[PDB]
Amino acid sequence: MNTVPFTSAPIEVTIGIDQYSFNVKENQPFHGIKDIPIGHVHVIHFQHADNSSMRYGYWFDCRMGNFYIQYDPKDGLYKMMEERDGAKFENIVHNFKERQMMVSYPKIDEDDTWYNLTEFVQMDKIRKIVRKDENQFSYVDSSMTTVQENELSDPAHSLNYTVINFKSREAIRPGHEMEDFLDKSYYLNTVMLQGIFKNSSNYFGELQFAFLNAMFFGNYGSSLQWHAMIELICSSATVPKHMLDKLDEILYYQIKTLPEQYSDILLNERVWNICLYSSFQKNSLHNTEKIMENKYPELL
Amino acid sequence: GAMNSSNYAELFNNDIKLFVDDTNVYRVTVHKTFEGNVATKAINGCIFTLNPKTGHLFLKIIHTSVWAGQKRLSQLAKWKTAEEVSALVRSLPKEEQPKQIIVTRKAMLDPLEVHMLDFPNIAIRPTELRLPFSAAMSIDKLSDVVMKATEPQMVLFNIYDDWLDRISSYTAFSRLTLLLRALKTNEESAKMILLSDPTITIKSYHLWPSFTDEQWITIESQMRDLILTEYGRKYNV
Numbered sequence: 001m002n003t004v005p006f007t008s009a010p011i012e013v014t015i016g017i018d019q020y021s022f023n024v025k026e027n028q029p030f031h032g033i034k035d036i037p038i039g040h041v042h043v044i045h046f047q048h049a050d051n052s053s054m055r056y057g058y059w060f061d062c063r064m065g066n067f068y069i070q071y072d073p074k075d076g077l078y079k080m081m082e083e084r085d086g087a088k089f090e091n092i093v094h095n096f097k098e099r100q101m102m103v104s105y106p107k108i109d110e111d112d113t114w115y116n117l118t119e120f121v122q123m124d125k126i127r128k129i130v131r132k133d134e135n136q137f138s139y140v141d142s143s144m145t146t147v148q149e150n151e152l153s154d155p156a157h158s159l160n161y162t163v164i165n166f167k168s169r170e171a172i173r174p175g176h177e178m179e180d181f182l183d184k185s186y187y188l189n190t191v192m193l194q195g196i197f198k199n200s201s202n203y204f205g206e207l208q209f210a211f212l213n214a215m216f217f218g219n220y221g222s223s224l225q226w227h228a229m230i231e232l233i234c235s236s237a238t239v240p241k242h243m244l245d246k247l248d249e250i251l252y253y254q255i256k257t258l259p260e261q262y263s264d265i266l267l268n269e270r271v272w273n274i275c276l277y278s279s280f281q282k283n284s285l286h287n288t289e290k291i292m293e294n295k296y297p298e299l300l
Numbered sequence: 301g302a303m304n305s306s307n308y309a310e311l312f313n314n315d316i317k318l319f320v321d322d323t324n325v326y327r328v329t330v331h332k333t334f335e336g337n338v339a340t341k342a343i344n345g346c347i348f349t350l351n352p353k354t355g356h357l358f359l360k361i362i363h364t365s366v367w368a369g370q371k372r373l374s375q376l377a378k379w380k381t382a383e384e385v386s387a388l389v390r391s392l393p394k395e396e397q398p399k400q401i402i403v404t405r406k407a408m409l410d411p412l413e414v415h416m417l418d419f420p421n422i423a424i425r426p427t428e429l430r431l432p433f434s435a436a437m438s439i440d441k442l443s444d445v446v447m448k449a450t451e452p453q454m455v456l457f458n459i460y461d462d463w464l465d466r467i468s469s470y471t472a473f474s475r476l477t478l479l480l481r482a483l484k485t486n487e488e489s490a491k492m493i494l495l496s497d498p499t500i501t502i503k504s505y506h507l508w509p510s511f512t513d514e515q516w517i518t519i520e521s522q523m524r525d526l527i528l529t530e531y532g533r534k535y536n537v
């Protein structure tokens with residue numbers, strides 16, 4: 001079990017850790033989060049009490065280093081840092097643990113939610129989407145735009161999601177225009193899976209990471225990316241059977257976790273209705289269709 | 301963006317553009333079978349691709365053999381239309397290729413866009429105008445070449461005949477759409493109007509009769525009367 005200590009909490013803030021969140025008051029004696037499950041990526045995120053604008057946060061994996069959060073009064077935000085002195089880090093974590101100034105990662109034993117949301121998400125792939133190679137953790141916020149969005153302005157602060165575009169030469173083989181546009185299997189299986197992602201695990205990891213950035217930060221380009229990756233599978237007539245079954249599980253947990261009040265902005269009516277009722281895969285997403293119909297029948 | 305009443309004179313500027321109408325690409329007769337079921341029989345069709353500034357009409361004849369063994373023909377017809385328009389553009393010298401293609405039905409946008417991915421700088425546009433190009437098969441010489449074709453064929457026409465020698469392209473297009481609107485609303489009446497006077501003939505190299513300027517004013521007035529009446533006859537007014 002791992003620990004992300006905090007220098008202090010000088011400003012009132014709502015702190016998220018994965019799907020959990022708690023309120024910290026201005027200058028409350030808060031010194032971090034303990035008992036964080038090893039083996040998964042995690043995200044620690046922030047919304048200031050004075051500015052519900054800019055949700056922001058850090059993707060990290062405690063196996064890759066000892067990390068802590070400190071508020072920067074110049075840049076006005078909680079920053080993740082790495083302490084490379086392991087002695088000093090255990091020594092500081094034990095002090096705050098003894099004084100019981102840490103919240104415990106509040107996982108219920110039966111509860112596989114976070115695993116199910118991050119099953120294919122790898123820190124090394126996150127760090128290629130979010131390019132800042134001097135750090136081992138990755139910053140994301142509500143406003144960051146995607147490479148594809150930048151094409152349609154600061155490239156250093158972009159989300160380098162894999163560009164998907166259904167009306168592009170990459171997607172459409174000369175002489176197979178109608179075929180490749182109505183049945184995207186070539187684009188999914190040869191261009192993206194074999195060519196770019198290499199395997200379905202890396203594809204699902206990017207899909208899950210895009211969903212989570214859309215949910216935790218309201219990141220609009222991430223939402224676009226998540227729906228595009230769903231639509232590409234659903235609009236392919238030929239998809240490995242293992243991928244369809246896993247996609248159904250992935251989406252089920254995503255829909256389950258989505259805040260009920262955010263369904264209006266985070267769910268694209270067209271994509272979902274196409275995917276569940278018109279696409280080749282309309283009969284292949286039984287769990288996802290059932291939770292969608294029982295939880296968001298309005299969208300459909 | 302979409303072409304409408306407000307950006308209408310853009311049709312007659314010096315940027316090369318084409319209207320594409322697909323309404324006569326896939327044409328059928330519906331009939332009863334011996335068992336009393338219904339079946340369709342395809343007849344020859346055509347793509348109607350028109351330069352509204354010059355009157356040049358690229359009539360790509362669609363022979364019924366192109367549908368043999370194919371499914372979902374109405375969907376295929378849109379893609380076939382886009383394939384043929386893209387081949388037309390590629391066949392033209394660069395300086396004759398259009399800057400814009402305006403489709404008369406929105407369902408043509410994605411097929412044409414996908415077929416024209418090689419031409420990122422050609423704008424594919426819809427229109428809010430309700431253009432009467434479906435009535436192109438009411439022009440006898442166009443119907444004739446479509447129905448006689450035994451194989452795929454492109455035939456080139458000037459749909460304005462020699463009118464541009466005397467009128468502007470705005471006026472020529474207005475006359476064309478009035479004639480076609482009239483033929484669409486009441487083909488028999490419209491065709492009676494055009495031919496009632498046997499002394500005014502159609503030149504071998506033309507589609508419409510050789511009216512004088514004054515006779516065109518009378519004809520045009522008769523077409524407007526026809527259209528207004530049918531509008532009454534139809535809505536009772």
Ligand SMILES: CC[C@@H](Oc1ccc(Cl)c(Cl)c1)C(=O)NC
Nearest residue numbers: 005006007067068069083089092
């Ligand atoms: C700049 C003082 C601050 O420095 C830190 C260095 C490393 C860690 Cl892991 C933390 Cl949580 C803090 C501190 O309060 N050290 C006890």
